[PDB]
Amino acid sequence: LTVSARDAPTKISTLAVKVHGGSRYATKDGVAHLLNRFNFQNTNTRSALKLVRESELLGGTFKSTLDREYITLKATFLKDDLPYYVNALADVLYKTAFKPHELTESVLPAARYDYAVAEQCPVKSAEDQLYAITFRKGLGNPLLYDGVERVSLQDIKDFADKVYTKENLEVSGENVVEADLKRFVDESLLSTLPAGKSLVSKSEPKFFLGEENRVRFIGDSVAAIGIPVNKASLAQYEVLANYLTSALSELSGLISSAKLDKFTDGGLFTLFVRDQDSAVVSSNIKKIVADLKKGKDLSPAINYTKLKNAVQNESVSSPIELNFDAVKDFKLGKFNYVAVGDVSNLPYLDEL
Amino acid sequence: LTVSARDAPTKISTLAVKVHGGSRYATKDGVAHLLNRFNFQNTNTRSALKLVRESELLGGTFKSTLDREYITLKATFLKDDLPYYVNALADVLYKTAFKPHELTESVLPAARYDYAVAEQCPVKSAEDQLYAITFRKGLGNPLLYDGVERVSLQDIKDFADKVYTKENLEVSGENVVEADLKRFVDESLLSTLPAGKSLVSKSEPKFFLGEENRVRFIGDSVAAIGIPVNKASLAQYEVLANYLTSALSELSGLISSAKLDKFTDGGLFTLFVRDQDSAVVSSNIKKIVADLKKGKDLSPAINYTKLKNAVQNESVSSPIELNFDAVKDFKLGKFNYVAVGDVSNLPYLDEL
Amino acid sequence: AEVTQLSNGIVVATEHNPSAHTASVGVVFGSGAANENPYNNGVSNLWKNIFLSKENSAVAAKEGLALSSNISRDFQSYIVSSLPGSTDKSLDFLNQSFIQQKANLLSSSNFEATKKSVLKQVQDFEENDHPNRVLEHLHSTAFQNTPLSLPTRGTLESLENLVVADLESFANNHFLNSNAVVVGTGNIKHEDLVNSIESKNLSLQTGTKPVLKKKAAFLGSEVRLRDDTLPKAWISLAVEGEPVNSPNYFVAKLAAQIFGSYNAFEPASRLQGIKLLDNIQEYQLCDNFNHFSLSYKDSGLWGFSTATRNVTMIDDLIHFTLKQWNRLTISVTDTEVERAKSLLKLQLGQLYESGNPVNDANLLGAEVLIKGSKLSLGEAFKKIDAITVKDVKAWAGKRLWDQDIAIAGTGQIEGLLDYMRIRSDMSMMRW
Amino acid sequence: MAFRKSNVYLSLVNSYIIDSPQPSSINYWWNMGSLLGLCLVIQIVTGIFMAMHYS
Amino acid sequence: MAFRKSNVYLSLVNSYIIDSPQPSSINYWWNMGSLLGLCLVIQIVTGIFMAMHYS
Amino acid sequence: PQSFTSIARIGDYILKSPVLSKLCVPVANQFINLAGYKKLGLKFDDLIAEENPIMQTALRRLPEDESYARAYRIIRAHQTELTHHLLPRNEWIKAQEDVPYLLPYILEAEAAAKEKDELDNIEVSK
Ligand code: HEM
Ligand code: HEM
Ligand code: HEM
Ligand SMILES: COc1c(O)c(C)c(C/C=C(/C)CC/C=C(\C)CC/C=C(\C)CC/C=C(\C)CC/C=C(\C)CCC=C(C)C)c(O)c1OC
Ligand SMILES: COc1c(O)c(C)c(C/C=C(\C)CC/C=C(\C)CC/C=C(\C)CC/C=C(\C)CC/C=C(\C)CCC=C(C)C)c(O)c1OC
């Protein structure tokens, strides 16, 4: 039960509760996605309709977001309604109703919409396979629910009993007095939660190199590569991503996107090439791979990547501390590869 | 233009025209499927409606079939109507109309139904995946048309002109006087076809070993393995297929299907395990590959294989003669692997 | 908090924030898309992409600077962002690359490449972005033959004729000291910024901007871009709204908050305290709608935008939404006004009090080019709290009750009725 | 939906004289049908009131 | 489609008399509506033939 | 058109009163036997009129096994009445089987609709 806050003379406040209950801890496929879409339904003391109508007259909103590591409950409100929104979030983690007709009428139709939206994007598909072939059963779990594995109402109740524990969540706030937040976090239903255990494992996950996968798709062709990164080489791949999508590189015109997703135990580097014509996708990916094998000098991009990292970290409260002062060179070694689209006209791994 | 037939005292005759124009010769994905569905449409001298009405009053039927090697046009009729069906088949290969309205009204909707009924069977999805990862381009080409690659009316016209040549087809008949068939073929429109070139190559197809693939699917789970086979080992894997499915093997109750597909230059061995429970599929495939790695004695199955071979070669007019007499033992080496279904609960290749 | 100084013609305004981790400086000009003509439409779009060109932005990356630029109807801005303590280089970059030396940027093979890329940016906007291209045609039809009707991105037909000599004409007429405000947001002090500007020359041109002959005037009209191959229908509908410098600026904004936004696929969006929702939910009439209130120098627009797949019941959607607008004149309740007050204060506090110094620079620079100062967030809250029910009814009876409207649409809009059937819904015969 | 479309009796009125889709090119010769409807009403009403005094 | 369902006039007869879905357990009290329509026809036909001789 | 919340409120007060329970419950048992719906193989909860939104919500949330059984009892009653007979005595519904299976779903749907009406007519003080 960690509580921290930052103060400021402003009008709006923000409260967040982060739970180590993302897709990488799911016991069944998509069970974490389903728990995300049940977070602000009826509780045992207040209805979903009553909460929406009451907070509108006070000036606040609610949201819940899912990724591969976290489930986040967030509230944005006016600075003087702090105690009201502490208890609203405490009741969600404590006494959610979990009714059989809420899943059939509200939760399942909402999950189908999310899955159908992400399925229409070939870049989201290629990123999912890159996570699947690099890490198989850890970070490689599917993010969204698609019905391939059956998940029942008791499964969602069981999953919530495991991740909603006092040792597995942190409380953060922006433009909030920290002494007042600590008082309200106590004398609340958060202090009466079960004291389970932290699900975080410190050891580096198992990864696999040299894999490949192909998916047929109607639309835009996409070629992507992925590289697992350890904890001591996160800064080197942070500079490379910014350099490859900046005016300092000649390959930035051939690259659609490039990023480094950071975890507390490592990361994954992703690079995507997307075009409507499969002849351009095949030609661009070959030039990028050959050029990266020769080697690149990343020293000119160190100052640029220091400012870009500051932009992203302003919103975040617990970013990874990086140095960037010792990044000198880079040479591509082994990587994974995924091709999505008109695969019959896209290259294989042995041809790159 | 090779013509051959066998006579018999029988009231029904059959005539087949085999063209080396299967999916392994297709210039575009599904272009051979669209030409197969375009076969018995309007020609330049006769309509599709007129052909059906006139043939029904004479007692005959038509059919067109597609596989990875051939496109076959078949006519079953009463014995005395032979000269009518020689010209009818010759007109299809010579003067098909290829009207733009016939593609949107009859040919495209028919191809959509064939694709819809094959995407629901996990065994057919797994077999196509095994062909793709073993041979990449050629025998690994997709069988049916799904619209991933745009195929136009001019592409179907161009493909037909390439495959419908005098040197690329063989004519055979059952319960047909051979002397009479040659005279009718000689004075038909078949003799005026272009003399192109044979599309069959005399070399061996390049293959790959140790590959893997996983596909998510809602329904039954399937696990499969695939072994490329050269010309000298064709008889050894024919005994292995019949030994595993028959009652001579303890593994027969765990194997859903097993077969060897034979070509002129080689073949492919396939084995399938399918069940609605993922745990059953996982345990069965592990036990199968561990038993085959130790070895088998395929001697007690030679006589059984000889009978089964003669059963399926009864209809085929050009069966390659295999020996089966010098088959002693088997030992599993390297193979390809595909998993379809609940892939988050199925084994990986390195665990087999 | 906002501090504004004057210096020989240019205006310096800052919004200091010590907790920020990034400072931002730039220049905002008080001329935009409403200052062009139907033959040079798209000049301000070319100047934006020339500033963000590959060669210009490569020089900025070496020092560790990032560039941004925005084009609107009234203002355009050019911003340089950097870490605190690097503000001296950002001012230097702006001086010698955009203010005093435009010849290297306007070279051949750099103008010809930028023009190639922008011609592609507007080709796919015109055939892929449907909701944002009917809101642009709404401006085109409601302000036709007046400066407030030209699209901000330009026109494809108009952009094929622009040459390099047209870009120098526009720069000479508008990039002037009397039309510019120098802004600084984030972690940067007012004293430091003004001292740096005077330590250098940092002077724009001397002339004054040309004045426009005719002002913007609203006209009730409609334009129909029917396309039966698209799967949806997109419709925008509005009346004449309020200018920026008006006493009814916050009353019109609060009126749009009463009806708000809607998402059919969000469980929490279906529980909002809006009386319109119970009419459009029994039969699914739309997928989403939003109510806006756009203000400019001369006029404004007030209305809503919709997208629906229920193409056979478009008339029901329009009939029910306009009948709820009528209640703003006759029977709006006290609970509806109190709820809209709370949601407007939250929405304003999320736009001016975000964490992006680039967003703040555009907002602060545009409000000074119009009224010479910036109204604080504390004072605006006092003005919103003072609104009463009698204020809403007076404003709605003047702007909404039995007034002319503007309509734009595309997609499957056969079920959208004629102008006179829709205009009849702006009043009730029972009252 | 609107009450004019959901009601059993109003929906027959709406479908015939309110929301009926008409071509935009029909001239004044297409006005004689509505006139014949007014003629029939005139003849019935005057005949009934005259029939109260007729033998 | 059958002619009794595609025709403009026969569709009304079919939807009210021929193919109307009825509950299977309605007793003989549900036969009074059809009797009331026979009474109305009897009154109108006899009244018109008597009106040819009335002053 | 009396709400089931009103019926339950009045009914409970009778059952928790020892004096009223001994004088009213015996009358109600004889009232039910004389009604005679059990002789057609029906429970009381099958007789509630369903052409309103409240009862259409409750019938939607009923589990499948209960929903299939209810459809059989209703069809059987229509055919038995068609013949002007009763069911054989061993097929009659017993008293211990006549349980209010649909009542909890009706009360839950009624409480939600009442809270929606009290929030649409809300008035904020101060
Ligand atoms: C009391 C007698 C009649 C009434 C009330 C009546 C009513 C109508 C009405 C309202 C229309 C549509 C409006 C219009 O077209 O002007 C119409 C159309 C029509 N009527 Fe009549 N009508 C009558 C007699 C007749 C007669 C005697 C004929 C032919 C011998 C006829 C044939 C037609 C035709 C063919 C149309 C459609 C024409 C078109 O739309 O192009 N009607 N009628
Ligand atoms: C389409 C409807 C009708 C038509 C075309 C029609 C036509 C006529 C005509 C041409 C006359 C001769 C009048 C004269 O020459 O002075 C007449 C007379 C008369 N009609 Fe009609 N009629 C109609 C409807 C009715 C109805 C419905 C009634 C009674 C309910 C009625 C009652 C009479 C009477 C009482 C007379 C007596 C003669 C007179 O009053 O002039 N009519 N009718
Ligand atoms: C000439 C006068 C009438 C005629 C021709 C007529 C005709 C009919 C017919 C054919 C039916 C359906 C079949 C049936 O239930 O028997 C019906 C049902 C009905 N009628 Fe009438 N009716 C007349 C008068 C009335 C009156 C005066 C009332 C009430 C004051 C009434 C109320 C009803 C009701 C409530 C039903 C539906 C009953 C049910 O189906 O459970 N009708 N009528
Ligand atoms: C413009 O749109 C229209 C349109 O609006 C109309 C009406 C029509 C006409 C359509 C029709 C079907 C005609 C409608 C009329 C009839 C079918 C016949 C009319 C019937 C009558 C007039 C009978 C009414 C009679 C009386 C009320 C008797 C009067 C006697 C009284 C009141 C006695 C006094 C009472 C006492 C107690 C002493 C159109 O064709 C048309 O174009 C599409
Ligand atoms: C669908 O369920 C129903 C049902 O709903 C109803 C109402 C009935 C009962 C009744 C009907 C269907 C009929 C309804 C009655 C009317 C609409 C009354 C209308 C009046 C008539 C049909 C009679 C009209 C008669 C004449 C005009 C004849 C007058 C005589 C003449 C012209 C002879 C003079 C000739 C010369 C040459 C001088 C059913 O039987 C029935 O089950 C099938």
Residue numbers in the entry:
A (entry chain M), B (entry chain B): 17 to 368
C (entry chain L): 27 to 457
D (entry chain N), E (entry chain C): 1 to 55
F (entry chain G): 2 to 127
Give the published text.
For example, in the yeast S. cerevisiae, these supercomplexes are composed of a CIII2 dimer flanked by one or two copies of CIV (CIII2CIV1/2). Complex III2 is an obligate dimer, which receives electrons from membrane-bound ubiquinol (QH2). In CIV, electrons are first transferred to a di-nuclear CuA site, located on the p-side of CIV, and then consecutively to heme a and the heme a3-CuB catalytic site where molecular oxygen binds and is reduced to water. Electron transfer between CIII2 and CIV is mediated via soluble cyt. c.
We mixed the supercomplex and cyt. c at a ~ 1:12 ratio ( ~ 10 µM supercomplex) in a solution with an ionic strength of 20 mM and applied the sample to holey gold grids for analysis by cryo-EM. Analysis of the resulting three-dimensional (3D) maps showed a CIII2 dimer flanked by either one or two monomers of CIV, consistent with earlier observations. Combining the CIII2CIV2 and CIII2CIV1 particle images for refinement led to a map with a nominal resolution of 2.4 Å. Densities originating from nine water molecules are seen in the D proton pathway in subunit Cox1 of CIV, which connects the highly conserved Asp92 on the n side with another conserved protonatable residue, Glu243, from where protons are transferred either to the catalytic site after binding of O2 or are pumped toward the p-side of the membrane. In addition, two water molecules were identified in the K proton pathway, which connects Glu82, near the n-side surface of subunit Cox2, via the conserved Lys319 (Cox1), with the catalytic site. However, in contrast to the earlier S. cerevisiae supercomplex models, we identified a cardiolipin (CL) at a site previously modeled as two phosphatidylethanolamine (PE) lipid molecules, which is similar to the CL identified in Yarrowia lipolytica CIII247. As in our previous study performed at 150 mM KCl30, we detected an elongated density corresponding to cyt. c bound at different locations on the negatively charged p-side surface of the supercomplex, spanning between cyt. c1 on each CIII in CIII2 and CuA on CIV. We also observed density that is attributed to 7-8-amino-acid residues C-terminal segment of subunit Qcr9, which interacts with cyt. c bound at CIV. The C-terminal sequence from Qcr9 is also composed of a majority (~ 80%) negatively charged residues, which would explain why it could not be observed in the absence of cyt. c.
